[PDB]
């Protein structure tokens, strides 16, 4: 196998399936990858790397600083309020803002470092009882408090579909989050929401067709 060939195939899929290929970013899911394999990914010409554990990304960030490698770090897992301090200075995008208290902690820490953190709002579109994401009603109730957090830059929304082979369910999930983004863009964000984070290795071609701008692909790149 060839990491370069795998990345190349995904970029071709983006051109083939996205309604707007120029907007789509590949997020390599590096949560199970050694720093040697990540380095191999970087050598493809891509450098967006997504992690889901704070301790793991913390140590990988320090490693690649010392190796002087340029990486756009995305945090794509569950973020505990008291762990925000460990990533606030080095992560470029937090995908998983699922509640107001987390957004407020991210805002407070961003302000203390004199920066604006880009975030996505995590939305539980399918309604899973392993819930973490916003329901739509909860988000609507939070919206104005959220828009007043001046050291957050809310640029889009995120969901994770359950694993399934049913293409109809996947399209329903991905299209539902797209509809939410379009609605939020009319009613509250004045079109400032540009990103749709959805799709992983087994379903990203569907997510691309449904308008995904961040596909979080692990196994398809590295295995």
Q: In the chain, what is the straight-line distance between the N-terminal and C-terminal CA atoms, in Å? A: 8
Distance of CA 17 to the CA centre of its chain: 19
For residue 51, the cross-strand partners are 75
Resolution in A: 2.1
Report which of 92, 94, 90 is spatially closest to residue 81, judged by C-alpha positions: 94
d(CA 130, CA 188): 28
Instruction: Kindly provide the b/e burial profile for residues 6-28, where b requires at least 16 CB atoms within 10 angstroms of the residue's own CB.
Output: bbeebbebbeebbeeeeebbbbb
């Amino acid at each position: 196998m060839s990491i370069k060939a795998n990345v190349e195939e995904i970029l071709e899929d983006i051109k083939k399936y996205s309604p707007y290929p120029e907007k789509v970013k590949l997020v390599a899911v590096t949560k199970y990858s050694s720093v040697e394999d990540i380095e191999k990914f970087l050598e493809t010409g891509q450098n967006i790397c997504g992690e889901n554990k704070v301790q793991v990304i913390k140590d990988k960030i320090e490693y690649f600083k010392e190796k002087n490698k340029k990486i756009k770090w995305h945090f794509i897992g569950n973020l505990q309020k008291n762990k925000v301090k460990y990533i606030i200075d080095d992560v470029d995008l937090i995908h998983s803002v699922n509640k107001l208290s987390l957004a407020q902690e991210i805002n407070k820490k961003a302000e203390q470092s004199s920066k604006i953190m880009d975030v996505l709002l995590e939305i539980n579109v399918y309604g899973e009882e392993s819930k973490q994401g916003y329901s739509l009603d909860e988000l609507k109730c939070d919206i104005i408090e959220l828009q007043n957090l001046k050291n957050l830059n809310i640029i889009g929304v995120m969901t994770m579909a359950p694993f399934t082979d049913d293409e109809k369910i996947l399209r329903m999930v991905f299209s539902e989050l797209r509809k939410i983004k379009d609605e939020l863009n009319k009613e509250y964000f004045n079109n400032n929401l540009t990103e749709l984070s959805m799709g992983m290795s087994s379903d990203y071609k569907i997510a691309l067709q449904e308008g995904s701008t961040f596909i979080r692909v692990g196994t398809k790149i590295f295995k």
